[PDB]
Amino acid sequence: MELQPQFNEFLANIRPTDTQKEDWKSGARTLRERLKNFEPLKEIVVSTFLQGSIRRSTAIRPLGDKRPDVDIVVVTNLDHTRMSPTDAMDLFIPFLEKYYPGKWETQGRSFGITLSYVELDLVITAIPESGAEKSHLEQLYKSESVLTVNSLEEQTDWRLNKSWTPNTQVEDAPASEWKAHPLVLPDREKNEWGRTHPLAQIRWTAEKNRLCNGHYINLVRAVKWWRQQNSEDLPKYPKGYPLEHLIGNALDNGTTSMAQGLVQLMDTFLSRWAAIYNQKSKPWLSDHGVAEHDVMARLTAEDFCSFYEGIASAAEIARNALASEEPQESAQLWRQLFGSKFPLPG
Numbered sequence: 001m002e003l004q005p006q007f008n009e010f011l012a013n014i015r016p017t018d019t020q021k022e023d024w025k026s027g028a029r030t031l032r033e034r035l036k037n038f039e040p041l042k043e044i045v046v047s048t049f050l051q052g053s054i055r056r057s058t059a060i061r062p063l064g065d066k067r068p069d070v071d072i073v074v075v076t077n078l079d080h081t082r083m084s085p086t087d088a089m090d091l092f093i094p095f096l097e098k099y100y101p102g103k104w105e106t107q108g109r110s111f112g113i114t115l116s117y118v119e120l121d122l123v124i125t126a127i128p129e130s131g132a133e134k135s136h137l138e139q140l141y142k143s144e145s146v147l148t149v150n151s152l153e154e155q156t157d158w159r160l161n162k163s164w165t166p167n168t169q170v171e172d173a174p175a176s177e178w179k180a181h182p183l184v185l186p187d188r189e190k191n192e193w194g195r196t197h198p199l200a201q202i203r204w205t206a207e208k209n210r211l212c213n214g215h216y217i218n219l220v221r222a223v224k225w226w227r228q229q230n231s232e233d234l235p236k237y238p239k240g241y242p243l244e245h246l247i248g249n250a251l252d253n254g255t256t257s258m259a260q261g262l263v264q265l266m267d268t269f270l271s272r273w274a275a276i277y278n279q280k281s282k283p284w285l286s287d288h289g290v291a292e293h294d295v296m297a298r299l300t301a302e303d304f305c306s307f308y309e310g311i312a313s314a315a316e317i318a319r320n321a322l323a324s325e326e327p328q329e330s331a332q333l334w335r336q337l338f339g340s341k342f343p344l345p346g
């Protein structure tokens, strides 16, 4: 059975809590305002915006009392050809010591800030463009479309368009205005600028979610929950954004329910990557933000193939759960995938 009400309850069980949600919204708003009024950075910071799984509504609730990772981008107007990533980061230390003493730390390519219930993960970026192109992009980064701290599932009317305003109509801006325009950020382990296009990833996710009738971001969270619940029998990677990317790739447009979507995306994953699995290899998958980047670049072939075996086992269960014509039996199969956060029907 599809058990749509039980899937809805499951999803409510695995979203970050309201306490966490309000903490990161307050945290982002307060960080943005402090940066905006901090005299040494006033003319450097273009925008401070919420990104990552929290922004895309693809984040799951941490286990126990762990704090969610909340990704934040600071957009600067620094010239990346004259300043290194660490030059840009160095500018923020007095700010962090003034407003977050004892609660921040450098974490390689980003800054970690500990709030009461969440952990902010701040990356410092720059705009590679110059002149009028730069000004047009700065206008986009300063718009409500970028500055909203609500997540995708809270604002299905959201579009990437400097003229979008919250529904207290418009479409995404023409691709020529943003598609070929990534930011640069620090590379993970070395002091060089790499490209990243979080706005394009967010827009792609919102659109995929629309194309999939609202089931895509829920399926991402459900599969992340499966991976966590079955972590002993799965490789450590993929997880996080590469896992999300594999799910968005495997899912077809037109999804009509969670249960159907799970079976379809698992079946498609297995047929699409069968040859790669037979070759003991891994796929090269273009990032939706920066086309020439392989999202799977750090994933090993061994981990991809162990993951493929895990999906192959999961798909048998999911097919049986969907096919079962009895509510209790069906729910017990779904719980074989997801654990007890997936509720039994009444």
Ligand SMILES: Nc1ncnc2c1ncn2[C@@H]1O[C@H](COP(=O)(O)OP(=O)(O)OP(=O)(O)O)[C@@H](O)[C@H]1O
Residues within 6 Å of the ligand: 051, 052, 053, 054, 058, 059, 060, 069, 071, 198, 201, 239, 240, 241, 242, 244, 287, 294, 295, 296, 297
């Ligand atoms: N391999 C990658 N390819 C493309 N973008 C990536 C990659 N790794 C990280 N990113 C970008 O950086 C953001 C922050 O990374 P992070 O590891 O926090 O992942 P996440 O998607 O927020 O998942 P989680 O909920 O586990 O934090 C990602 O959401 C994604 O936009």
Ligand SMILES: Nc1ncnc2c1ncn2[C@@H]1O[C@H](COP(=O)(O)OP(=O)(O)O)[C@@H](O)[C@H]1O
Residues within 6 Å of the ligand: 071, 110, 123, 185, 186, 187, 188, 189, 194, 195, 196, 197, 198, 290, 293, 298
């Ligand atoms: N915290 C982040 N915020 C925005 N983009 C990110 C973040 N982390 C990684 N990315 C994107 O993912 C790409 C790959 O990053 P990563 O896997 O950490 O390896 P590396 O930086 O060594 O290529 C980056 O080039 C960037 O596009």
Ligand SMILES: [Mg+2]
Residues within 6 Å of the ligand: 052, 053, 054, 069, 070, 071
């Ligand atoms: Mg994150």
Ligand SMILES: [Mg+2]
Residues within 6 Å of the ligand: 052, 069, 070, 071, 121
């Ligand atoms: Mg992070």
Ligand SMILES: [Mg+2]
Residues within 6 Å of the ligand: 248, 249, 250, 251, 252, 253
């Ligand atoms: Mg697809």
